[PDB]
PDB file of C-alpha atoms (C1' of nucleotides) and ligand atoms in Angstrom:
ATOM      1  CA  UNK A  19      -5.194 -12.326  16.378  1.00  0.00           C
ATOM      2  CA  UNK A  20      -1.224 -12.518  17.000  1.00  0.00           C
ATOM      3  CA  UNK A  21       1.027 -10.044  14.926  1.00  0.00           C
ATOM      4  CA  UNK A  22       3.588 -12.735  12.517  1.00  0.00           C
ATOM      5  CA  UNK A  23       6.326 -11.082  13.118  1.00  0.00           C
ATOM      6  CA  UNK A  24       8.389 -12.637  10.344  1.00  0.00           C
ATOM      7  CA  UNK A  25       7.156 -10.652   8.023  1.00  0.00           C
ATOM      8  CA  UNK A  26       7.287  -7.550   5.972  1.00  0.00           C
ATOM      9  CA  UNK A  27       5.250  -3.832   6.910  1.00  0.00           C
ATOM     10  CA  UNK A  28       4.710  -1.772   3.896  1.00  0.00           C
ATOM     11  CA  UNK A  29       3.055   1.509   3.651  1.00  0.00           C
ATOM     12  CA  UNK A  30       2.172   5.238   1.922  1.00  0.00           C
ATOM     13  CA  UNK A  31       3.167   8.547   3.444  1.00  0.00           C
ATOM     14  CA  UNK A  32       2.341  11.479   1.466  1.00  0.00           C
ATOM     15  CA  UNK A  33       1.827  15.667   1.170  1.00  0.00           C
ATOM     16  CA  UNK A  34      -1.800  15.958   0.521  1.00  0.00           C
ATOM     17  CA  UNK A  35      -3.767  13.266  -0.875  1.00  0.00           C
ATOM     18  CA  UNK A  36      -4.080  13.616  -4.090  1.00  0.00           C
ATOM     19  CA  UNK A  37      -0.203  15.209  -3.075  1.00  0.00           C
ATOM     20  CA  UNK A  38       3.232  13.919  -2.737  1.00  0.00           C
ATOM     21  CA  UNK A  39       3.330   9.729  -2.505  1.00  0.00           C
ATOM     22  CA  UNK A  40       6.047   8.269  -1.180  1.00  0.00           C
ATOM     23  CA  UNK A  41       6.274   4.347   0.538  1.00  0.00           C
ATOM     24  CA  UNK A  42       8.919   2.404   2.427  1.00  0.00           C
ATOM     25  CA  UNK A  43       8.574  -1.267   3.624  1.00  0.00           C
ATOM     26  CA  UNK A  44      10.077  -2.327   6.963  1.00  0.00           C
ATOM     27  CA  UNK A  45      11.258  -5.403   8.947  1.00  0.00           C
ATOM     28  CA  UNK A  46       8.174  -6.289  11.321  1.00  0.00           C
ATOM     29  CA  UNK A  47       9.970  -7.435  13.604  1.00  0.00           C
ATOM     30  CA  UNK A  48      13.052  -5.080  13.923  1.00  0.00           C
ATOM     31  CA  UNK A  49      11.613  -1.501  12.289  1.00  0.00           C
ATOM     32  CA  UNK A  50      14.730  -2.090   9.977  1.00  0.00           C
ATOM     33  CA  UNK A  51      13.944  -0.010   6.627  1.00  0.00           C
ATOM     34  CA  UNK A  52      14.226  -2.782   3.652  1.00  0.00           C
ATOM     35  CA  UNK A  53      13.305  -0.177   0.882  1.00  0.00           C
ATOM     36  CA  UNK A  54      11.908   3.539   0.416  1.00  0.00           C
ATOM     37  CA  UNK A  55      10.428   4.913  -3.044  1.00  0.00           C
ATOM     38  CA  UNK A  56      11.474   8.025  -4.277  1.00  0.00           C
ATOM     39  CA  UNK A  57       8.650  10.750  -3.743  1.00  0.00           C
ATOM     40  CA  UNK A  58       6.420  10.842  -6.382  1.00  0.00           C
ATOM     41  CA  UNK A  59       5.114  14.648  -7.590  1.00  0.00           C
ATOM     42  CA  UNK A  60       1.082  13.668  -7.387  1.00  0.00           C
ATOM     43  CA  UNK A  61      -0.758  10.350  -6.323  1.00  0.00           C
ATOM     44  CA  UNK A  62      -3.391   9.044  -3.834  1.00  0.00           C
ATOM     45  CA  UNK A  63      -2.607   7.584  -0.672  1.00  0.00           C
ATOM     46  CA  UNK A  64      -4.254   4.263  -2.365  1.00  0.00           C
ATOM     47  CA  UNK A  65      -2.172   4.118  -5.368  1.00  0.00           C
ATOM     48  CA  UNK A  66       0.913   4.227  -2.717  1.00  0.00           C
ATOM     49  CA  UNK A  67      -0.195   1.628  -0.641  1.00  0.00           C
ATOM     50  CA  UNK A  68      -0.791  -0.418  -3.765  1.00  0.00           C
ATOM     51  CA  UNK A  69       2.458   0.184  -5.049  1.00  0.00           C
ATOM     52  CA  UNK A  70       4.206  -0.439  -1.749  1.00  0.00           C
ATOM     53  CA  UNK A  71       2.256  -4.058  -1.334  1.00  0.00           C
ATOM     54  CA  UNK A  72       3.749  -4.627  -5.122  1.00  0.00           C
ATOM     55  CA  UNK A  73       7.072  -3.846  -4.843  1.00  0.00           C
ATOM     56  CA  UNK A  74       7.078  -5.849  -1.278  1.00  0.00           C
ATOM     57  CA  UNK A  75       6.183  -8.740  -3.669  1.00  0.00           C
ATOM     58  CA  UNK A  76       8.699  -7.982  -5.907  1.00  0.00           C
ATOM     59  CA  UNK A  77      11.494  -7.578  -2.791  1.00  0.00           C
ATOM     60  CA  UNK A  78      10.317 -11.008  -1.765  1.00  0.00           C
ATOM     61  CA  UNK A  79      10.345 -13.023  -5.399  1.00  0.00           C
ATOM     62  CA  UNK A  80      14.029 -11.581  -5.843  1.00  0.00           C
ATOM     63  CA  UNK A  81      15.180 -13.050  -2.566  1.00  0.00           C
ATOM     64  CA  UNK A  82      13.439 -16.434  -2.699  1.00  0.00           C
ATOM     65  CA  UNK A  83      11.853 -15.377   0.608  1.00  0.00           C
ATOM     66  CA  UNK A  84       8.381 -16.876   1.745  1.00  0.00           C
ATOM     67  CA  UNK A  85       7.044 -13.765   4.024  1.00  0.00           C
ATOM     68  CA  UNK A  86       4.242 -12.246   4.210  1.00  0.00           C
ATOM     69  CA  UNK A  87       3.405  -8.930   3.822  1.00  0.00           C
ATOM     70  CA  UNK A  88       0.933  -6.267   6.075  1.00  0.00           C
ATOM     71  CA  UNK A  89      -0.904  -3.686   4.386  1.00  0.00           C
ATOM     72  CA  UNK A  90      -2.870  -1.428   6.649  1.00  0.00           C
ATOM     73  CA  UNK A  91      -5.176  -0.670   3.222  1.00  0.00           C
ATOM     74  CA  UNK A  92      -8.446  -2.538   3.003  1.00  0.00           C
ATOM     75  CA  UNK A  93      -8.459  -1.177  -0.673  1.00  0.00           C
ATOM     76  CA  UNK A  94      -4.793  -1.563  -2.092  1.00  0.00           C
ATOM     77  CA  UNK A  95      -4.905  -5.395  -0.595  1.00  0.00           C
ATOM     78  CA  UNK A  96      -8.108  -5.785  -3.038  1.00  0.00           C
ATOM     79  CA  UNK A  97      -6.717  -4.058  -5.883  1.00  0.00           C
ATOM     80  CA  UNK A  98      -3.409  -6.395  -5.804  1.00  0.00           C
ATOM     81  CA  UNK A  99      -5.991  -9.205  -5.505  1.00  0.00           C
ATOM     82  CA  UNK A 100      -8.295  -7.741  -8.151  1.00  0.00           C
ATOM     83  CA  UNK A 101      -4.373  -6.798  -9.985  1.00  0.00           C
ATOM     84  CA  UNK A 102      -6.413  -3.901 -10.971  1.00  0.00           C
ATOM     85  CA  UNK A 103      -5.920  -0.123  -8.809  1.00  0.00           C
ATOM     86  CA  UNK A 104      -9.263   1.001  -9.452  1.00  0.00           C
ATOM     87  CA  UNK A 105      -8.029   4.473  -8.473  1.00  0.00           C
ATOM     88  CA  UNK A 106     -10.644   7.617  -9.298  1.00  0.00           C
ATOM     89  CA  UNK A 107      -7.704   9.500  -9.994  1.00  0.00           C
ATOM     90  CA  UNK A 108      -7.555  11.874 -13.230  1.00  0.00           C
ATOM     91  CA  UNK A 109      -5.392  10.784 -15.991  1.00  0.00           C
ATOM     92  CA  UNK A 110      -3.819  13.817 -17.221  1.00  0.00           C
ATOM     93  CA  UNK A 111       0.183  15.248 -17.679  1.00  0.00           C
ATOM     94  CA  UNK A 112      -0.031  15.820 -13.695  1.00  0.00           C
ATOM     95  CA  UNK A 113      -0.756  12.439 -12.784  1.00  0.00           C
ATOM     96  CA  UNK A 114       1.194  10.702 -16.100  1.00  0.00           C
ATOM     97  CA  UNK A 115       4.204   9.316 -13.290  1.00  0.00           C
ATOM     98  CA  UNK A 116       2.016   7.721 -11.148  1.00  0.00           C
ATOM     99  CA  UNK A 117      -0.009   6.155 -13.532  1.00  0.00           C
ATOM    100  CA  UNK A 118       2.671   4.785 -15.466  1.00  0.00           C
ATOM    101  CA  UNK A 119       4.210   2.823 -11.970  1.00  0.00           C
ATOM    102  CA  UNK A 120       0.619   1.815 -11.758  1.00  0.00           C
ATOM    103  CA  UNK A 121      -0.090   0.134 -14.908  1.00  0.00           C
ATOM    104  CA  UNK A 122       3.405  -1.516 -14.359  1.00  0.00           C
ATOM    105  CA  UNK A 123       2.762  -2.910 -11.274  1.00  0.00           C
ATOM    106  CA  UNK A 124      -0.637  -3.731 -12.243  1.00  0.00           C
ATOM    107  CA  UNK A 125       1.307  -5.531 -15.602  1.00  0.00           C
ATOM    108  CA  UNK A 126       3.334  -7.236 -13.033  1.00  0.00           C
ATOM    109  CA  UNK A 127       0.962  -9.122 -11.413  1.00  0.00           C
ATOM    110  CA  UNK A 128      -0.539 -10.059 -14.472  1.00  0.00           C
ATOM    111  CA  UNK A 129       2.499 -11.921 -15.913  1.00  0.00           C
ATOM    112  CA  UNK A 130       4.264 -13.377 -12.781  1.00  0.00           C
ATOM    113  CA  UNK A 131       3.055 -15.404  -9.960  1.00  0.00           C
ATOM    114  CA  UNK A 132       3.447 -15.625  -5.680  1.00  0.00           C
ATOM    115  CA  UNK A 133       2.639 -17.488  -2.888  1.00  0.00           C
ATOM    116  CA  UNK A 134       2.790 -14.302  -0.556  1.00  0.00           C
ATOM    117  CA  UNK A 135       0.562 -13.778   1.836  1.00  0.00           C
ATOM    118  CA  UNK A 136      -1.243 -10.177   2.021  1.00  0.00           C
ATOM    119  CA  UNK A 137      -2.541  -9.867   5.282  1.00  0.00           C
ATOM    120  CA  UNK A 138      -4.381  -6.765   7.378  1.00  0.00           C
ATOM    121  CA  UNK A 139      -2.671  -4.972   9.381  1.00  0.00           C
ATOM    122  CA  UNK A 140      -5.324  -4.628  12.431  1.00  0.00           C
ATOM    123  CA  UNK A 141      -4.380  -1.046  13.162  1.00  0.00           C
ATOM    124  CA  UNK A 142      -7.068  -1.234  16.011  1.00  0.00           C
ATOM    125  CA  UNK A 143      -5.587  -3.845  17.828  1.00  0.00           C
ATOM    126  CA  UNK A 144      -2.052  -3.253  17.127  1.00  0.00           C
ATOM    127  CA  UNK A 145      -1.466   0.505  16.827  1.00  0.00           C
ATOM    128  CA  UNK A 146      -0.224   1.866  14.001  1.00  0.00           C
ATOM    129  CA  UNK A 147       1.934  -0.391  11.199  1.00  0.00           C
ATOM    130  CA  UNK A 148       5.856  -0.230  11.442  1.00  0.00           C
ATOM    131  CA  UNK A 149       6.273   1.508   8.083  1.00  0.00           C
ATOM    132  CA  UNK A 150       3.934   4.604   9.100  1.00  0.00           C
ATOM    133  CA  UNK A 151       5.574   7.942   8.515  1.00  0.00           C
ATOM    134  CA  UNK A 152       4.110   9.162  11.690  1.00  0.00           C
ATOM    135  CA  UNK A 153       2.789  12.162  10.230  1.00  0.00           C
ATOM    136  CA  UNK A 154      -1.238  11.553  11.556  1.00  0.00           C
TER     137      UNK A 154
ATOM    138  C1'   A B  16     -19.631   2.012   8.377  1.00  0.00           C
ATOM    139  C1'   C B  17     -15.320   0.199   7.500  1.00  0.00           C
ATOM    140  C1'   A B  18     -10.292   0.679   5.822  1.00  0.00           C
ATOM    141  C1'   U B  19      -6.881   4.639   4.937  1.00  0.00           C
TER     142        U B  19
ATOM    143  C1'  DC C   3     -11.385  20.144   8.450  1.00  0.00           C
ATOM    144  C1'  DG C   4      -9.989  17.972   3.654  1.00  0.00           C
ATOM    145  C1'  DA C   5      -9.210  13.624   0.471  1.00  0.00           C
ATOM    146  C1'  DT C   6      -9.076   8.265  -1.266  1.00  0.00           C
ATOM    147  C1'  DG C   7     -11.441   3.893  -1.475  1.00  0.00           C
ATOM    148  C1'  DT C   8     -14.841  -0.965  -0.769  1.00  0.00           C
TER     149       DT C   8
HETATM  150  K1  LIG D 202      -3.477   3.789  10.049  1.00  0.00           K
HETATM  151 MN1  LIG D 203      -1.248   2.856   5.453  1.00  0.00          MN
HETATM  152 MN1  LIG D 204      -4.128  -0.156 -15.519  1.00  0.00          MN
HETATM  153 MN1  LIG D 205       0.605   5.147   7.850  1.00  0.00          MN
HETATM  154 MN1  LIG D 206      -3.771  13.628  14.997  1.00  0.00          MN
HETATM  155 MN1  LIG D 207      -1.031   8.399   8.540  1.00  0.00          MN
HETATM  156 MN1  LIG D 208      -6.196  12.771  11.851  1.00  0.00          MN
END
RNA sequence: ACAU
DNA sequence: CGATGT
């Protein structure tokens, strides 16, 4: 219903999907860019949004900060809640990279703990999420 | 049919 | 038009 502002906006861009991933997180409130990953050769847009939501956890933990965090992915806020990417993407030399930030983050979740709230971005409402790469 |  | 996901 109302947009918390005090919060964090993460999200995926990429080139191609499977293609070049890539994810940034954002200050709702300001647009202020809080972190960007390092493009990644091959990944889904899924396994970016889930890796985005992760390290937003991760940004949060280190700074003793109670935020929450909007994901515009229906999917990658299950998988965090699952903390298991069920991604259909091939395991093979190509997709190694990814799938080794994956299983970490996945590992992450399974050995520390958050109060963090992962909420919806309601893109329909609210246009598009702060961290989008404008590229649609 | 909904979310990317 | 193509793809990733529940
Ligand atoms: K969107
Ligand atoms: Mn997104
Ligand atoms: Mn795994
Ligand atoms: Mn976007
Ligand atoms: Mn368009
Ligand atoms: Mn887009
Ligand atoms: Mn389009």
């Amino acid at each position: 219903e109302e947009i918390i502002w005090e919060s964090l906006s993460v999200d995926v861009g990429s080139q191609g999907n499977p293609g070049i991933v890539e994810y940034k997180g954002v200050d709702t409130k300001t647009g202020e860019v809080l972190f960007e990953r390092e493009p990644i050769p091959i990944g889904t847009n899924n396994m970016g949004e889930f890796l985005a939501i992760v390290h937003g956890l991760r940004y949060l933990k280190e700074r003793n900060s109670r935020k929450p965090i909007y994901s515009d992915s229906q999917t990658a806020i299950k998988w965090v809640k699952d903390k298991k990417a069920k991604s259909t993407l091939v395991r093979n030399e190509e997709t190694a990279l990814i799938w080794k930030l994956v299983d970490e983050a996945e590992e992450w979740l399974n050995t520390h703990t958050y109060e963090t709230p992962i909420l919806k971005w309601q893109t329909d409402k609210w246009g598009e999420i702060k961290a989008d790469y404008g590229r649609k």
